[PDB]
Amino acid sequence: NVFSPGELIGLLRAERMGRALEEAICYRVVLLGITRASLNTQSFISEASFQETARVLAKAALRGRIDWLKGLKENVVLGGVIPVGTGFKG
C-alpha cells in the first residue's frame, strides 16, 4: 500500500524508507538520460512540457497535479519574478 511495483522514486527517499519500513522493498539503480530524467520532474508547466506537450499535460490533468512554482522556466512562462539572484528573497 506504500509503493507500486513500477515506480521511479528518489534514492535518498528509498534509503530512508528502507531504514524506516520493514515491509519488503526492492529497488535497483536506474541510470536515467538527458531526455528521460527531464520528463520526470515535480513540475509540468516548463520542465515537463517541452518535448511531448501532449501526454505530459494529459496525465497531469488526469491526476490533478498541484505544481509549486519552485523553478525558473516555470516563472518565466508565468511572467513573475524569477527566484534567482535579486528575486531570491529570504
Binding site: 538527458i34 531526455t35 530524467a37 527531464s38 520532474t41 520542465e47 517541452f50 519552485k70 523553478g71 525558473l72 522556466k73 527566484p83 534567482v84 531570491f88
Partner: peptide
C-alpha cells in the same frame, strides 16, 4: 539546449 533543460531548479 538539452543540458540547460536538464538542470534549472538547482539554485544555492
Amino acid at each position: 539546449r538539452r543540458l540547460v533543460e536538464v538542470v534549472q531548479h538547482i539554485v544555492v
